[model samples]
Target: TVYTFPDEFKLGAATASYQIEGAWDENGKGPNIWDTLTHEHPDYVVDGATGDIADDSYHLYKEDVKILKELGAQVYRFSISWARVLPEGHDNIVNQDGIDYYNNLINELLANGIEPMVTMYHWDLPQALQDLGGWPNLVLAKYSENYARVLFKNFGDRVKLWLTFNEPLTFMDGYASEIGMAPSINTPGIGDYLAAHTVIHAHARIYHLYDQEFRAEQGGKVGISLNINWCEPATNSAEDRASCENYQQFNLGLYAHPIFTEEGDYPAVLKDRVSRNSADEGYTDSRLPQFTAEEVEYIRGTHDFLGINFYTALLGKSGVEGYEPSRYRDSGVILTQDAAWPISASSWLKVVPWGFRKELNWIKNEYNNPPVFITENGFSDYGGLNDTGRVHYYTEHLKEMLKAIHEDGVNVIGYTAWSLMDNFEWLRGYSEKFGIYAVDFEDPARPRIPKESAKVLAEIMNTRKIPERFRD
Candidate 1:
């Protein structure tokens, strides 16, 4: 079957601030948690590499814009480093150099006919905020609101699509596990729940701020990016099926339930499980935070659209594992990938294109078909110019997504490749490359050369259809 996208649907690529824009501390930019993490604990990343110079996009953004133009990309989704603009993670002290850098990047993208999609936070929390107890502190929600105001005042005129937070599910783990992402505080169950609670409030605050202050003139949209891998039942038993549903509720529905669902609260199953677990564990209160009625109303329908960052899927079965009071234990779902699935350089990522269609259908049914933007989707591999593996990944995933759009009627409005070029891969660092354009880390210039996947993506974007050979 030949698959084509809607005329209004967009195609592009995405990159986060710390992942690609590697000045680290240059140009009066304050340090972020990633900076502190990679520098202070070099061994945290597998390659012992830091993003201090990853891709050097801080200085080479124009080159990136040029590449996007060449690829016929309709949009570019990049993040703002909170520390870059507000040195102390407050609005009082603004950095002109940091503001100028993003202004230049946005202008360049517009000049090349690429719409600039801006993510306000993408796990690069300002160290100053982390010092003040980070996302778990409700005070930081107000700080995040203030930060969003600054961004809207500066960049809202040009950036129509704004994402308040990217994948809180991924970053909330930072507070839970010791060896997790930046601000890797080992507070486990308590801290992770607190961080998520604050993040959801922060997202709602930012959305309200935009609606009241900026939307009248800016005509912009505000949304949050939540990533979830599709969970298939390991077996057809009632227990396994229920476990898979619980996994979705605990993961994606944690954030999406409040924002997208008509009834704005945590999924009932999630709350029940956590509350029961907390009681059994002798806690006076549930580890999972509660949202007051007012808070629930405020957060409900906060998103203009849903930004989904999907990559792979996992098989889920009924089980309880992990330390006491942990999210894993609360979820009571054991996840594992099938060995028969094709593997990527990243252990967690496996080839599962059909999962994409299933996930889209799930989102549509769960959220009443809210518009979805594929914020990030790509396959990782070891560095190479001839990236046939990535090309295959893109083709298969696009085919599945196209099926969702045409056959399932999933309201997917846009799709962005996970990355335009290889850069820092967080804890995995430079060891796993998720870029269509490979970067030569050995070279000082950080040259970005198009891999085979880049060529395939270019063709898809330009033609607005899956290539004939890739179609079913």
Candidate 2:
């Protein structure tokens, strides 16, 4: 049976500033954490690649928009580099060139009849902010709000949809592990919690700022993009099931609870487990930070929607493993993938399309069915123009998403493919290609070539239905 999308449902593609825009230091743009990381420690990335000139979307944004038009994308989700506009991470001196660059991109998208969904932060914090203690320092919360003000004042008029942060769970890990991500400070339990605390407050402060200053005039929405994977029980045991639930609470709920839930606080399971673990490690205070009652209320109901970036599923079981006093140990979940599950170019990603439906249902149940926009969802390959694996990935996951909307009554409003073109994929570098359009990195022109998956996606967008060949 063929599945059709809702008439109002949107389909598009997404990219982040640091991942695609490669004028890293030109036109007065300051160094970001990634810039510092790749410069200082070149070996941090698997292939020793940097975004110094990845795809050069900063120069070829018109071509990027033309690709979107060719694919008939209804919307496009992209992120802003915090350092690009405000080199110092403060609003005192705005980068006019950076502002003009984004303004041109936004205008070009609008001219081609594509809506622009702007994400304020996507893991590219200015090096200046990192030097001043980064997200771990609470002072950065107000600074983030100030940055949002500059964004709304500049682009919020033409750009109606806004996402404050993309995948805080992924970025907060930057502070936890020494070799994890940019500004990779190995503070483990302590720095990760501090970073999350400031990020949550920053999200709320920005939401309130928009509500008070820009909503009436711009009529836009504000939300955060979170990356979550469905967790399956490793076995038919009470402990395994409980461990799966704990994994959800610890990873996704860490940020979602404060903003989406009615009572508005950290999940009780997360708080109790971290506090208990902290005590076992002979710490007087819980490694997990606590929000005051007033703070909880302020953060609650701050979202217009929830942006979910889902990819795959993991099998979880109750186990005491990983570094002591770490989030992994605190949650007591051991995650693995089924040996039979199809693998991707990225080792951690396995093809489990059913997990998409399950995860959407989990969110609906957990958060009373708030409107959800799939901010990012795509598969990766080593390098390809054929891209049959990616084609299968998109169709199967899309079928699962449609099932959630039609059968499970999940309020999914939009879906954007993980990327428009291949660019620097952080630690994995350019080795893992997630782009629908393949980019020639070796060329100075950085030409983008559409893959087989791009053609299939264009068909899906044009027809507004899952093709019969892919249907059940």
Candidate 3:
């Protein structure tokens, strides 16, 4: 019953800026797209809920670290609000109070012996930047690089692992997905594809900056986090298998192909597929951008490691559609429910442990085998410390990770749980919880309560073996 970890396997937790840190627009923090989107369009959020006081982590970050300490976690994956540091969303202005807040948090994590994995931007764009065409415009790319330079100057000394952007592909869906995050619209190829190009440029620009200026002196690694669902063919037939490939390009290739593929375009087949479909519907250019030689060179091989986030696997069948399907499902991946999957409170995530192994192997074969990290992967359910669902999800997923490392010969360095504490879920609001320690969002102070998962995680972290209490 005792499960152990590999030597470099990192046990950690993850959170976002707008989710956990909710001092929106305070202390000179600039307004992000989430703040505006949630406020301007109340109808977008699930249950019409907002994250005015999510976990109150901005104020109680110390308490947050205490939970990590107990969990025996080695790393912490947290994001910095773009506006938090640059109220102007550009390099021209740096907010001292914002800088002080992050410095304190980073110092605390290190003091408690946790390596900080910093995600530079986690979908929370400064409203000012967004108002100026945001991700669609090329100016933002240069500014993002400038912003990273400022961070590199300040915190790059101690913070080694850096992520340029978190899930660059999801913004397209977030804009168009009725789920109600920032820029929530249904414009699939239009909104998301535009953002995808800008994000790639931004990541490459900042990475080059780090390599050219800081890597030698400060010595840190930079990459991006791509959270993709594993989509498998429903049957062994070629048509069904094609559905899986379609799902891969639209979902994974949206970002991965640009960075990994030698030609540096989106998967050639999916590009032609979407483009022809779009032209038939009357669009000038393919919604997705065609990479220039210069752009492709910048994007390909841009990362030190792949910060992967896996939640569940899907069975994709082809040519039978009744319900709504967009670019992702139009991937012709007619998703059939996997009954064997362990269920979670949020219906979207099904606990498929082996999916993790499949995904890591996919990366190895696809991209000349980059070093990998499970940046964020976990399950969610309603509240309760006895989170049996979450416990099992972690166990199976970690076991899959072990298989990838020990047997498959994939190079994975770390794993971070989907979350550290419950926070604003955007569409679901605070309804679904994915935290090892649940946050009492109802409480005025928003106190943290350790769940059984937290204790189990703590043991896995500290002793590297299953302690007796993990069974409880």
Candidate 4:
């Protein structure tokens, strides 16, 4: 069936501040954790690559706007480097050059008839903040709020869509707990939870701040982008079904349940399991911090919308080993990959188009059908300009997303591709490419060439048609 997108449906591309804007130490820009990790511990990155000059987009943003204009994107989602604007990551110091740089980019996008969707943070906390304990430190929450105010004061008049934080699961869990993305710390259960708790407050603070201070005159909306991976029950058994629910609540529900649900508190399952595990660990309190009544009320209804970054799904079953007494073990579930699923260059990302549909439906039902903006969704190629696999991936995922809207009536407003150009992917580095435009990394010019997939994207963005171009 051919799907005709609604005229209001937004088609766009995304790039993070650190991923593309690579001026690591210029114009009063403070060092970030990524700058420190990639340079100091070169071995941490797969290619030993750093974002020191990634795509040089800081200087070539006009060139980037030209790409967006060519692509026919209605919206362009980009993040701001906190340390860049506030080189000290504090309210006292403001880098006027940093402010001017973003103003230029925003004006360029508006001039080209592209709406600027601004993301406040994309996992690049200043090294100065890291020196003072990063997100896990309660003190960072105040600083984060101050940083949000600075962005709102400067850019809110023009930037209508604001995402407070991008992919907290990846930045907190992957980097702090699971994988050593930056700062290379492994705190599995503890660090991720602490960061999560702090970030929730930071997001709520900004959302309410915008509501109180900026919304009436600026007419802007604020939200957080969560990295949501669908969890399918491994089998039709009671244990597997229960296990699946546990994993789902622990991951997606941990973040979404509080903000979107009628009651804003941790899911009962999460609290019970964590309490049991904490008892075993000899802790007086659960590793999952208890939110006070006042905090829960303050955090609830903070978002005007929900920004989702989805890539893959995993099957969950009972009897998984949780050696570290972390969130995974507390759930009593094990996640595994299906041998039949198509794979991406990244070890963890698998192709499962139907999962996107399932997740959308679940979120709609769980969160009372909040407006959804797909902040990041795309496939990673091993490396290629042709990228037929990515073309297929985008087509299949869009089909599923359209079905969720047309058939299930999910209130989806916009879709942004994972990236506009190939840039430095953290931890995996530049080896994994998720860009519609192929970039020549070795060239000092960093030439951007449109990939075969970009044509399909341009067609959909321009015409709202969803035919399989790869077939031709």
State the lDDT of candidate 3 residue by residue for 1-472, as single tens digits: 2256776677799999889998886888888888887787877777767766687778998998888887777999999888989998877889998888889989999999999999999988888887887787778899999999988888999899999999876665665554455766655556666777788889989999999999999878898899888887788999998887777777877788888667676787667776776676687876667778777877887878888988888998776453222465345568766897768888788877777888888888887678888899888998899988888777667777777777888888888897999889877888888888888877878888889888777767777754554333
Superposition error at 145 for model 1 (Å): 0.6
Q: Candidate 1, residues 110-182: lDDT per residue as tens digits?
A: 9889999999999999998999889999999899999999999999999999999999998999998777798
Model 2 misplaced regions, further than 4 Å: none
Cα deviation of 381, candidate 4, in Å: 1.1
Query: Cα-based RMSD of the predictions, in order?
Result: 0.9, 0.8, 2.4, 1.6
Off by over 4 Å in 4: 174-179, 468-472
Candidate 2's displacement at residue 289, Å, is 0.7
**TM-scores of the models, in the given order?**
0.99, 0.99, 0.94, 0.97
lDDT of 2 by residue, 1-472 (tens): 2289999999999999999999999999999999998888878897788999999999999999999999999999999988889998888999999999999999999999999999999999999999998999999999999999999999999998999999989899999888879798999878988999999999999999999999999999999999999999999999999999999998899999999999999999989999888888899999989999999999999999999999999999988678875888888799989999998999989999999999999999999999999999999999979999999999999999999999999999999999999989999999999999999999999999999999999999999999989887
Better of 1 and 4 by lDDT: 1
- Model 2: lDDT equals 0.94
Clashing pairs in 2: none
Number of the top candidate by lDDT? 2
All candidates in order of lDDT, best leading = 2, 1, 4, 3
lDDT by residue (1-472, candidate 4, tens digit) is: 3377877889999999999999888999998999988888878788799999999999999999999999999999999999899998888999998999999999999999999999999988988888876877778888888999999999998999999999877777643443387656677778778888888888888888898888999998898898888888889999898888887788878888778787998888988888888888798878888889998999899988999999999999887566675667777789999999999888999999999999999899889999999999999987788898998999999988999999999999999998899999988789999899999989999988899889889988877878654332
- Which 10 residues in a row give candidate 3 its minimum summed lDDT? 320-329
Clashes of each: 1, 0, 5, 0
